Design a protein around this ligand. Structure first.
Ligand SMILES: *[C@@H]1O[C@H](CO)[C@@H](O[C@@H]2O[C@H](CO)[C@@H](O[C@@H]3O[C@H](CO[C@H]4O[C@H](CO)[C@@H](O)[C@H](O[C@H]5O[C@H](CO)[C@@H](O)[C@H](O)[C@@H]5O)[C@@H]4O)[C@@H](O)[C@H](O)[C@@H]3O)[C@H](O)[C@H]2NC(C)=O)[C@H](O)[C@H]1NC(C)=O
Ligand code: 80N
Ligand code: CA
Ligand code: CL
Ligand code: CL
Ligand code: CL
Ligand code: CL
Ligand code: CL
Length: 340
């Protein structure tokens, strides 16, 4: 109950790199997706070690220049999304009509160490696929959040018109995909927080789709039916508010209802009643030790369930978004004894 919570560094990547999201395997290893300098999945093996091994799993260059989100489907299979991008610059826009979803399959004896990788589907009509979450009652299907520029172009980007946010379903067996929820301002940005996205990370808990909005300070949830469509009247509900640029989040540890969410150079815990507490980073004595957290997930081994593993993409606290020093990293926060 002492804040900030204990934390440690697991690994830094090189200058220019960007770790964007995380899925924890049933065996406890971390799988992290990178946006720059290439779109790859890396594995941190046995992350509870002081100095865990960090190994490239797969570079998805055949189909994409960058990965964004990752999410587990059926056990030890994962969907990643990505696209081509005009450059490796931190401010680069994506190339319109180049988004894709791909699979890493670690299931079965043949794949448990080196996975089988495939293209699931092209998404040329999407804008920017972002976060991935499987339907818990039908895990071969995922929802995928989608929002960024309507007209992304080579630098200098001048028309910053944002596309309205939306949420896809993707059937990873057949490749079929369609938009299941759209046209709500809880999905959108008006650049109240500067250039950014609207809907960003997603998770599904019970029959609720949860997301964070990077522009309006709100964490939202939406009652959904068995195919991901909203139950009428289809109105998002604000779960928590904090004037910070959210990115992604998780529930836990174990079965607990607490939300653990990345914000602006800081990590937050949010109670189901909306009480938000800054637990690490800026606004604690951590100061700027963890610039640009991007996502977070709890350990899955029986001896690290209370450890929150945090991905990030900056090497220093940036002056503004036009002077970002990218550097990918993963840290571990020990949440033991935190409670509301
Ligand atoms: C990866 O990128 C990082 C940048 O994000 C590179 O680190 C920079 O490297 C350059 C070149 O070596 C350094 O530039 C020199 O800075 C000298 C002094 O700079 C002081 O003032 C800075 C003002 O903000 C300050 O950030 C910096 O603090 C750093 O050093 C302290 C010890 O001296 C340390 O206690 C701090 O924690 C921090 O690490 C200095 O106090 C200046 O005299 C020179 O003329 C020259 O300009 C930058 O300072 C480095 N910046 C940082 C943040 O480390 C790094 O080299 C890149 N790696 C590779 C492999 O290229
Ligand atoms: C990596 C950067 C910012 C952090 C990132 O989360 C945001 C806000 C991206 C939006 C964009 C591309 C305009 C800014 C790029 C500099
Ligand atoms: Ca994100
Ligand atoms: Cl490889
Ligand atoms: Cl639009
Ligand atoms: Cl249901
Ligand atoms: Cl609230
Ligand atoms: Cl606080």
């Amino acid at each position: 109950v002492k804040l900030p919570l204990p934390q440690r560094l697991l690994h830094d990547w090189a200058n220019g790199s960007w770790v964007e999201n995380i899925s924890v395997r049933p065996n406890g290893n971390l799988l992290v997706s990178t946006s720059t300098p290439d779109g790859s999945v890396w594995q941190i093996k046995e992350p509870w070690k002081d100095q865990p091994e960090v190994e490239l799993v797969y570079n998805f260059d055949q189909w994409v220049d960058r990965l964004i989100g990752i999410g587990e489907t059926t056990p030890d299979k994962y969907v990643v999304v990505g696209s081509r991008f005009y450059s490796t610059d931190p401010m680069s826009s994506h190339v319109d009509r180049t988004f894709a979803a791909m699979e890493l399959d670690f299931s079965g004896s043949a794949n448990k160490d080196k996975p089988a990788v495939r293209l699931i589907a092209w998404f040329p009509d999407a804008h920017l696929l972002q976060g991935v979450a499987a339907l818990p009652w039908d895990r071969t299907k995922v929802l995928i959040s989608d929002q960024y520029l309507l007209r992304p172009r080579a630098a200098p980007q001048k028309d910053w018109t944002p596309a309205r946010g939306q949420v896809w379903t993707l059937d990873t067996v057949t490749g079929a995909h369609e938009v299941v929820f759209a046209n709500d301002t809880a999905l959108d940005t008006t650049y109240r927080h500067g250039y950014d996205v609207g809907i960003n990370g997603i998770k599904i808990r019970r029959d609720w789709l949860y997301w964070v909005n990077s522009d309006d300070g709100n964490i939202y949830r939406l009652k959904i039916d068995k195919t991901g469509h909203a139950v009428p009247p289809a109105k998002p509900e604000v779960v928590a508010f904090q004037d910070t640029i959210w990115d992604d989040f998780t529930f836990g540890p174990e079965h607990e209802d607490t939300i653990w969410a990345t914000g602006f150079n800081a990590i937050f815990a949010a109670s189901p009643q909306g009480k938000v507490v800054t637990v690490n980073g800026v606004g604690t004595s951590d100061n700027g030790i963890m610039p640009g957290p991007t996502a977070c997930a709890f350990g899955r081994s029986p001896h690290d369930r209370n450890i929150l593993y945090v991905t990030g993409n900056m090497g220093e606290i940036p002056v503004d978004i036009e002077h970002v020093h990218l550097k990918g990293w993963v840290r571990a926060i020990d949440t033991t004894g935190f409670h509301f």
